[PDB]
Symmetry: D2
Subunit: 437 residues, 4 copies
Amino acid sequence: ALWRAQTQRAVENFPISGRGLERAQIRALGLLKGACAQVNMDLGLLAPEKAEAIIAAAAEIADGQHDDQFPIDVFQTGSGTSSNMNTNEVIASIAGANGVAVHPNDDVNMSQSSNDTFPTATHIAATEAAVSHLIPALEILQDALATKALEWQSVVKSGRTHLMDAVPVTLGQEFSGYARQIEAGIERVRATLPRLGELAIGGTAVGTGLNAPEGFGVKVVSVLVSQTGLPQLRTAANSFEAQAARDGLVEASGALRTIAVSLTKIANDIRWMGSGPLTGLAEIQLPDLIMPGKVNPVLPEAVTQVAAQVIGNDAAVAWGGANGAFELNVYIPMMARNILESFTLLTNVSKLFAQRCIAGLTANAEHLRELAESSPSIVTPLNSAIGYEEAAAVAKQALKERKTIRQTVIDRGLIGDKLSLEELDRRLDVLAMAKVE
Amino acid sequence: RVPAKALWRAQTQRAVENFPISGRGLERAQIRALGLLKGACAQVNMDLGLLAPEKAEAIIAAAAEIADGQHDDQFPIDVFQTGSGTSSNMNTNEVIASIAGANGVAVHPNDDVNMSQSSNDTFPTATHIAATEAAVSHLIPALEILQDALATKALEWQSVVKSGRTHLMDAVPVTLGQEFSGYARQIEAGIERVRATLPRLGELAIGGTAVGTGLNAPEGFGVKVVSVLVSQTGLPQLRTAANSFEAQAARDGLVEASGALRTIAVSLTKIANDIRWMGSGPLTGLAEIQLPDLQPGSSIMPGKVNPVLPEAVTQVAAQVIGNDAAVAWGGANGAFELNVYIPMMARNILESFTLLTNVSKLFAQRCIAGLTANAEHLRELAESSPSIVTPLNSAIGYEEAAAVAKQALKERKTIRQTVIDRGLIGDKLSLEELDRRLDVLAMAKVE
Amino acid sequence: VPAKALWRAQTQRAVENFPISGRGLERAQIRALGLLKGACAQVNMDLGLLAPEKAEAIIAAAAEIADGQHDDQFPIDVFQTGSGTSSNMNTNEVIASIAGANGVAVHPNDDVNMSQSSNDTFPTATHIAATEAAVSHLIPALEILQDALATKALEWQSVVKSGRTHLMDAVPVTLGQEFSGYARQIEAGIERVRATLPRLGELAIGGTAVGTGLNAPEGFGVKVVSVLVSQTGLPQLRTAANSFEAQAARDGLVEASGALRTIAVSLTKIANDIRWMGSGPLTGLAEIQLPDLKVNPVLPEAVTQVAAQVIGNDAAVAWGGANGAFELNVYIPMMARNILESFTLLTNVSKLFAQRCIAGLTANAEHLRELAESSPSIVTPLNSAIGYEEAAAVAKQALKERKTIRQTVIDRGLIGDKLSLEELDRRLDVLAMAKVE
Amino acid sequence: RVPAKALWRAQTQRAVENFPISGRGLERAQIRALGLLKGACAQVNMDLGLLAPEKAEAIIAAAAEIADGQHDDQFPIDVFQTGSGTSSNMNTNEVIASIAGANGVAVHPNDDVNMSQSSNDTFPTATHIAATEAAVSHLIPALEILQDALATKALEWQSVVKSGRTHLMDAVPVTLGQEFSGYARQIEAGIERVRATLPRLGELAIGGTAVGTGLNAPEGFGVKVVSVLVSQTGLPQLRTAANSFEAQAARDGLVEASGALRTIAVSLTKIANDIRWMGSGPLTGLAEIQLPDLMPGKVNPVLPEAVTQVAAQVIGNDAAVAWGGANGAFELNVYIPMMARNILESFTLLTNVSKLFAQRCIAGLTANAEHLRELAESSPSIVTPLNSAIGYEEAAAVAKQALKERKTIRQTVIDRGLIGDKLSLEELDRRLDVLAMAKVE
């Protein structure tokens, strides 16, 4: 039981959601307090006994030893002051228990304000989320899809446009498109990093840096980069923008929202291809997670639900981001919750979708080819041999009798001087029609 | 392999391994609703001679423990699970079977605990029970607390005249009471909006079984179960669905109810924003009212209170708006006989109910109730506005009235003092007539 | 100022100040402004505040506007001052010009705007227009759609097919049952719109600048509303419950937009099912045929795109709604644009969808029944005669040979002492399994 | 039955009758992109020897009239049409065929004007052309104008000290210049955000034909058409798609670009809200700055209201784009006309309002500098540097007395008799130097 009077009052003030800061947020706050103590010691402003104790307490917090010591609601003062002081109070208690007296404000918060610390910890968490969690999970997903694209490179089937019969494509081509959407997702997350990684630390109460030592922010960021291995962390381009607004969070959520849109398409196609068997498309078999197989598309359902959550969370992030006033945007804890949750859900579901659905998909190449070979969409190359009228009669009879176009052309007595069997086979070569590269 | 204290079994444990996505499971209220439903189903199956009394009574007793919140640690499955909520349905069946078994009665999770049921009709039923209970027993009473606090303050401030603001610019007089009666109306209308959703929010799918047809459930199963649920919850809002296909193919009642919560979020944002603006400064702001200090510390400095409750309220509203977008997205995307976005939709709507309930009460009791106004002063300020010179026109002419306005601003004085200063009291008008014409409380036209 | 222009100086300035979208008010918004100005002139006359000669010229000019004779006289951008003052003045100026050309001098502010402020006039016209749109346009179009769906539900009451849950094969239903579900969604949409009318019909008129009624006669609003009800035949129009709430907020528009948003969600499901039912034919479900306008499902596409627009419009309305300050919400023209567009799009596409898609659908009943009679989903009723192990084997062989369950039971030599042909047909009666009520 | 002056034909008239939904057709920029595309296709088909030069040149000339805005009245089909935009594609082919015929050359709308193209790779190409042009040639230049206006104020007001505000409550000093530098950065970052979407916004589907495979287009048709488009538009951002299937099965590039516009809306909401608050009152508000005007003065903040309403529209439009984007199926996303409407409108609104806001509001702002500095010098926030001279007790007593009497800290220190051997006037003025507290870099 390590927090003190201030945190206790915040517990009483905000019984709203019953949920507090997440592991990554507590980690970031610990990392930040350690870096600030280090710099304050480097500069000779904080006595080494005090600093080394703070640095040790902060390392415990960062390592996840005191997650039970952060009871404050997400829905707290919009600067995150409550959680800032929560971290200061906890560090002080730990230091004192190791027989070193430090003041939560004067020592643990030395050279800092809430207004620059809580957004810094938020951006450390979000940058770490993008770089060390989500991008690698997206690469796992891109690789699974790309591997399918290769495996199925020659697996010809019918295209569908407007949900209607269309000319041939391969499953490999379609899956290459999904792989590109996830590759583009990775490009989209990376494109946000130059601004997501900007940190407010050193701007103090209003962005001017008053009561912080010269270059405090530069030095803290330097320590943070070396401790996290994230070179994307950087001092803000403009100290006022970095505290008056959280636009980088709005930007990064936009990339996550685009990824949610891509995943909705990929997952929807996958459950449709797996549908039926009798009542559906029965094109592929999904891994099952006395009687015939009927696998529910549970992972596609989890993906599409996660995407809806990201859409909603993204709307909440933008709403908070728009509503800053003057020197401070006071929607930080709510914005932090939503973007970090979006990173988490997308990271975790992308890996599961790749590994326990995509990877083990199967298809019947022989059957899918025989079906593409049955489509009215492929009769066009016959027009110059048999005329538009016979071609339409062929298409009708093929559908009615449930035969291939080839077989119907044979059945209707069209093989002869104007159309040989080998010419028929050439003009109706559905794999060639897919134009595989 | 299952933990030793665990009352769940193999199907639940598989779902734990399949969906490690958010790390969050069903809320207390959803678990309670699953318990209530399973008890009521066992009661009806027993009533109808379909389930032997020894089995049914053990299931009913076990389901009551769940409903009473004794087993909230027995529901480990992620929110982001199969979209019908089958995993959570099975979780409930397994936990009930374990409880029954530990009491010496063997029951089958599917054949007995799920008798006459599907997951497709059970999970959306439990969802609508929880949402209806949230609206009726939690949110409406919290909104009533907030409405009453706003209305009490409006009466207290009935004669506290100040300048209106339109476009953020100086306007004619209003009272703080009048503005607060407007806030109270927004909350009163919020309650009306939630009540208007109840006829459809309260519809339950139970009895529709796998596809809405009621196949493999006894005739009138749904009607009988709903009757038991109404008796046990005291919620007469719970009813059988008007159409059994609509009630499974869609979750449109959740979308509708979320829309009401979204409107309330919009109202709360306006109310909270005004109150923190009125509290702003003191020196750089409007300094119209003082908010209760929720963070006092030892100090010999002038007071400066942060508007932490309006910040909590406005952040809650943002969350409700996001949650509402999430609900609508899941709601649109059903296919054929089943909408498979249920656990995600349930999570978002029930959270919006919880956040609004909790923050409305806090806002009412720890912010609204103790607001104070700077009143003799708000009045001096309204008495200084160029907005109030119009009623002088018919005594002194609009050109002199305009000069009065300009001089008042320049010398930072009341309109009244400026009229006196310019020597107009005499033949043009008496002091009593001036005071009648410039009575700013009267200009507010309090009803 | 253009020669044929009936607007004057203030309007031409607004034209120059807001070249933003290049779109002005819609016909319905212009009409409502005309109705309002007519009603105000009538009341001011009744009260002896406005000379009859002036009032009658204003009344006649306002009626021309209400009748759509001057839809070209309102050039101001939607994106104008957020009270809609510019459009208010635009109306006053146009009326003055019409009166003038009929030989009667009236002052746009002192006469046409007598007893009024822009702050109570523009939202009043907005709510008149939205109430009119709901009652006289949308609900009648939804009724046409509900009737078309219900008609199909009846026509197809015995058209048995397999259900689909998770997109996977399920026990029998009828096309008629599914359409009854669609009809209920639309019936419920009508209830939803009706439920918003008590607050959508609330009008701010009489509240003047800040909601107090300063500079309007006692009971001005009630008297104006009385005239409006009498002219429009809309009993839903009413004075606001609270005059401050009615000007400080536009919550009734947020509420009404929420009902439109729910209808958009319902229409998305209905249109999606219909285009899937009509898909293929070869590569899809081939359940029904859509009227031609292999037909692409162009009306389901128009419906789903309209619903997307309504979702977006609704987000804009809520954003405006939350952001009022003190005595006035200044997002009215934008909010009005979006809600009124959503009414119009839903009205027009609902009628088209009903009359040019739903009404002419045809069902492929034999293909539907054949599939249902071939489903492993229907073997359960055989258990009590042949055992679940044999029932499983029937299901497997039926799938392998593409035969009905019935024929498979015969083919496996099960008819005789185990069960008779009559008993087999009773147990496998798929229409009976749908349990039509 | 078709109107007399109409250059469209039967397929377009059927579309007019089929989709009477919104009553609104394509915008000028969309019609222009369709003409540009058709001209480029005819050029390439002629280059490849597939289209006779007389036909191709007639098509090229017609398409140029369309690209030049000469026939924006010939496109009557509703936005809410078939979701591939096939109807508008056919509308373009028919209008071109009519123009060619009026100029004495017979061409077939399908066989000639649509040669090598399909009903599914044309409309998304024209959409991405229009969106790329809008981003590069219209929006970014307008944001640069706004950035410059804000940056100019940041410099002009670099010494205009005032009190900071956090949580809406009094805070330590800043300058108006510093606050405006924050706004300028938001707009500069908004330009960075738009630029960041260009590698994917500029990808074009042309050449993929019906399903993305390029069936029935000549080898390299896409590459060749893109080269002509680049030369004609001067937009090197136009490029062939990385993956031809992704470019038709999805419109993810539009969702991405809409996200950047949404962020700009979020930034503009903050800047406009601050500006109208600064201009508020005069008596009831903050009265920090005076806005240009578009009895005593009381200017309504009309441009901040226009900006915040535009921002709301962009937010709604952005939701519509994402909803359409998510809902493709298999080889084609069929929400193209609706997505195009919304993203292109968001570009147009932000372009026009940004320029107006910059030139007709920001440029002419004036600051109440005396009142601002005097207020900063009156703040309890600035007494901390007195602690070491007069002690905590008197520093606090000074803050209280200053507020009560509506005086500066400086005058209150004098009034309390605190000037002596522990504190000179020169030292008092150093310690209470509010501009120095703003630490202007």
